[PDB]
Amino acid sequence: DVSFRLSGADPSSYGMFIKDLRNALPHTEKVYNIPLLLPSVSGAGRYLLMHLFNYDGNTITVAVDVTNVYIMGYLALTTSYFFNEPAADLASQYVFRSARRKITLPYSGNYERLQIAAGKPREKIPIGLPALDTAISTLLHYDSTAAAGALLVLIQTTAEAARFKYIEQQIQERAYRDEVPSSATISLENSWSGLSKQIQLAQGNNGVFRTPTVLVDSKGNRVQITNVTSNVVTSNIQLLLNTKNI
Ligand SMILES: *[C@@H]1O[C@H](CO)[C@@H](O)[C@H](O)[C@H]1NC(C)=O
Ligand SMILES: Nc1ccnc(=O)[nH]1
Secondary structure (H helix, E strand, O other): OEEEEOOOOOHHHHHHHHHHHHHHOOEEEEEOOEEEEOOOOOHHHHEEEEEEEOOOOOEEEEEEEOOOOOEEEEEEOOEEEEOOOHHHHHHOOOOOOOOOEEEEOOOOOOHHHHHHHHOOOHHHOOEOHHHHHHHHHHHOOOOHHHHHHHHHHHHHHHHHHHHEHHHHHHHHHOOOOOEOOOHHHHHHHHHHHHHHHHHHHHHHOOOEEEEEEEEEOOOOOEEEEEEOOOHHHHHHEOOEOOHHHO
């Protein structure tokens, strides 16, 4: 398991949590020096538990699929909550079994459905450590509309930060003040699968992407990633979705 506590949290302790999260995801090889997530894992070993504590010390446990870093569901006191999707129902067979009741959320876990439920795109939702503290607090007591927004914050400040050093740094910059994500942040989130695939396809293509990936950069400018010498590949991305899952 991995843990993070918002009480006394600063950029350093957050960075330690994101390091812990990355290191909890198993891999057998690296591709261009980046850990390649496994094609599959069977049984309960597929799911990582993240223990998150809000400023007041209340806690949820979030279940994360270790092959793709997708949040499947979470436990708040004696109630489990899972996304309305087969991967999440499957996860419900293995985690939080001792919960007194299980609630299936009235949406799946993908960004498009969550944004619909939340009533806003995540371009408009501030993120940061304060927003994460709020999100944890919200998830403690069932409210499916508020939960959708909280889950958008949660996914971005955990999973997305694990996937990209840039996003981790953006959240560190928002340690004490929330701010909506940069366009670059949004772009990276949306491109993780594409980048993961192209970096793998480059293995037998001399480091050249079969299909270039269009990103937005730190300055709001739209750029093309064509090969593994790009900073996105050498710096930034920290985990690869296995092409077998793409
Ligand atoms: C590779 O990508 C680098 C970094 O973005 C770029 O400067 C260069 O033009 C590209 N070279 C090839 C061979 O694709
Ligand atoms: N890490 C993630 C979990 C759920 N949905 C996502 O889009 N990403």
